[PDB]
Amino acid sequence: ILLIMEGLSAFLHALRLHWVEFQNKFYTGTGFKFLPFSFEHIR
């Protein structure tokens, strides 16, 4: 109840704070991800 469920709840709500209340102030977050030709084909 507490460690997994309540912990997960607090986890996501803190994420929510940083996302919504905090980052709206300074952060744009509309750019492309840089994913170069980095021999990722190892998978």
Place this chain on the structure above:
Amino acid sequence: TAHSFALPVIIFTTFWGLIGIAGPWFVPKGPNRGVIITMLVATAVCCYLFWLIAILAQLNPLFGPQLKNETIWYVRFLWE
């Protein structure tokens, strides 16, 4: 019970201030330098403010705890 609002504030203020101000001068050069110094400064700020607010919550208390007669009887013996 010598719980002054003098010594704890100096000790913990200087503790977190050292962490957040002097440590960055001792961190070596490196790529992780940025996140490391940020960790030091932000940790100092946040923890110090947390403890400060917690103790000032008790400075000049406005109302007292309400306790069962059982615990009052026991504490009268137990505590100073």
Place this chain on the structure above:
Amino acid sequence: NNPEYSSFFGVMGASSAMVFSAMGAAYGTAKSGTGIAAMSVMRPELIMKSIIPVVMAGIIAIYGLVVAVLIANSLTDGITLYRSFLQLGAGLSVGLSGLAAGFAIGIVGDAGVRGTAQQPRLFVGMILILIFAEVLGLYGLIVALILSTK
């Protein structure tokens, strides 16, 4: 000089706390369950990742039980009218909060688990929405314990 009829409200607080949270949990289990049953025919590997909403409805139920049992323990034969009304307030708060939160949990789980069946990426969105729902039951619990303990 405590009216004997006053104690009724504390019993009703306990009842409400149990029953309304129970109905919310029941609906939440029900809709999520029908969703799970529908999904399982096509994507059985998702059963355990999809039962989570049922667990969350269970958490709504446990919230109801906690508040109800606390109210019961606080009850007494000459309970004052003030305290009894406090217990009724706690009971209604938690019970109806659980009802609403369970409705949300059930509908969200149904729609979501179905959504994941066709699009597994949605799982994260599900779990986020489900916890946001369960948070309503958390608020009910908060208020309920505050009133029940004052």
Place this chain on the structure above:
Amino acid sequence: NNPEYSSFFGVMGASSAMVFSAMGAAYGTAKSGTGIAAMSVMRPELIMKSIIPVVMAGIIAIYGLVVAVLIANSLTDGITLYRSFLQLGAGLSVGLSGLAAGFAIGIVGDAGVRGTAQQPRLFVGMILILIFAEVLGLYGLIVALILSTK
């Protein structure tokens, strides 16, 4: 001195503030969640940004909670009927205003996400309408706080 039943309306206010606003938040959560789970199928990249309606809906619940706990700490055994009436008014204000807000957020978000799945530009207008929806809950908080404080 004061009538003994006064506390009943105080606890009713305390409950109402949380319960009705919570019902509104629950409905908003549900509708927005179904919309999210629908839109995810075609445009799975938009789910996190598009959760903003559920994020906004939970705020109605926050409002309900704050008014509830404020009424709670204001309550005591001997309040005058005048004060109990103010508490009831504050609770009903925030709760039912939040219910109206929650219907607004639920409908607007449900429509908005589905539309955005076909037209990403809508997102901004969705946010605008959602703000115009939350402000209803906010006004309920303003009136409830004024009343409860008086």
Place this chain on the structure above:
Amino acid sequence: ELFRSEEMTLAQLFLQSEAAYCCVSELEELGKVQFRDLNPDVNVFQRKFVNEVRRCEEMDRKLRFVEKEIRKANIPIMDTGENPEVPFPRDMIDLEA
């Protein structure tokens, strides 16, 4: 540093057709560049090197078939750790054969 995001910029390259493959293979070894598409106006299967991708797809299909045969059978597959760059020379066709 992490203090703020990266300072990315645009660029372009001229090279002789033959050396294009080897040089971009060295850029794949490096890994610090991201390539654009200079002919989106028509499908990738209608560019200068259609057959080259067609045969790589088919060869990987056949390698998946033999790998499936391997998994059905009991022989392992060697995770030797070597990850060489594919030769540009027409030894490509030897590998094909």
Place this chain on the structure above:
Amino acid sequence: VITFPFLFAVMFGDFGHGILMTLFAVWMVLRESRILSQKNENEMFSMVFSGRYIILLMGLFSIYTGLIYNDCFSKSLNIFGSSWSVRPMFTIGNWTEETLLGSSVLQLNPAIPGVFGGPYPFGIDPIWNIATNKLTFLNSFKMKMSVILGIIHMLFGVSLSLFNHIYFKKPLNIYFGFIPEIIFMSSLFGYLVILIFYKWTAYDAHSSRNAPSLLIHFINMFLFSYPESGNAMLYSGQKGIQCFLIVVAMLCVPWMLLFKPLILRHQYLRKKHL
């Protein structure tokens, strides 16, 4: 990297549960190589492992915050001793075995000088964890704390926009955004911050019967409705300053709103066009 563990710890604040989270975090972190090699399809487990470092910092900060709350599985740690005391009530006050018999929950009060020897040096005093009135103190403290933390966090956020606008060389952004925006913040909610600190410095036990209330003062300040009755002003001349802050805040909305469209009309509909 820090503040997310921070706020999650404000929420999850518990010494013991922080121990458990840190234990799980390390159990993952030390074996990360084995997990990375022998990865599996469990999506939830894999995502948590991905988040292990976040979980580690999260657990450490929950440890710190739980100690500050004086909470270890909801219980206190007792090490530094209680600031509250009991006997000085019997001595200076008027408690008697009769009172301990006839009032199940009695009370305690800081007014008489013998009871309280100053705030607990680190965290909240252990007595609250057993005191029935625990909620009255803890709710007010945690409410008003969450307030201070959130507003300071938001001011930090506002500040973070200046370093964007500087590099992007957006003087209009700076001038008619940040500055007005940050003034509106500091004036309205930063001022509530100032008051929440001030109260703890201004009033005490002997003020308890009459201490004012920040909700009422703030709402009156928004209303321009300062009464001459009820609880008194917090400090001398408060009316002028509070009216000034409200006027500044209400002007900030016009200040940010109107000028930038006007300035853009000027430079991109009169200039570049005349």
Place this chain on the structure above:
Amino acid sequence: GQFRVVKEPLGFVKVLQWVFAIFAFATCGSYTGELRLSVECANKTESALNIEVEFEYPFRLHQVYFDAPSCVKGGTTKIFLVGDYSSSAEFFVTVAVFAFLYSMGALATYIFLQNKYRENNKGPMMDFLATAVFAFMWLVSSSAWAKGLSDVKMATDPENIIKEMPMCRQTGNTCKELRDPVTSGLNTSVVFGFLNLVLWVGNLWFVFKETGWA
């Protein structure tokens, strides 16, 4: 057998550091103190002639209690001493325990492992460091513990107790001391603490030869 190594006088400095703090721990962690007095109320039938109380070396004095006749109606009311000094007592006695254990380990190394001990004078260096650690701990603990013992004597004074008691404060009543506790063991403990401090300090100069840094 390198028993001769400990037969050297430096070995004897360690033997001193090992008999001391052993007898200091023994003298401190076995003490019990007793107080007694007499209270004679206006109504002689309400007097308590041979009041008693007892306490121990952790000295949680505020926990130490007794009930005295309240000088009215023969009823007794309860009484507590002032303060505690565990913060000094337990720290000091635990220091006494630790120091001799380390000295024992060192002494074994002296019996058996000299050629490893002086390996690049590593043994001299580490022994000097541990000597310094114990010297600092002895210094601080001894100072705080003398302060304690003094405050404790003042707190337990039967005369101070009687003064703080209201019986003499209440009219028409006479009270006096009956017993004042002894403190020879604790006096010995603190004296041994200062002696340990000086011994460990001088061991720094001694091992300054063995490190070669003198």
Place this chain on the structure above:
Amino acid sequence: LCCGPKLAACGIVLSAWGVIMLIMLGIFFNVHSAVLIEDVPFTEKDFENGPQNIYNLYEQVSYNCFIAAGLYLLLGGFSFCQVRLN
């Protein structure tokens, strides 16, 4: 006796946590700290004579904690045996 390695691992972790927590609880109960008062099976008659009685019941609960910590020690050894058996 035998069981699946994951269940055995859960057993060992559970046993270790039990030992540590109950050692803490027993330590503080034997110290008689107020923080744990309500868990003491005290009786109304006890609050007349003096606090020694409540000390002894505190110690009863402390011993009981130490006993359960012992059962957890046995369980931990058992589960470790099974883990290494697998």
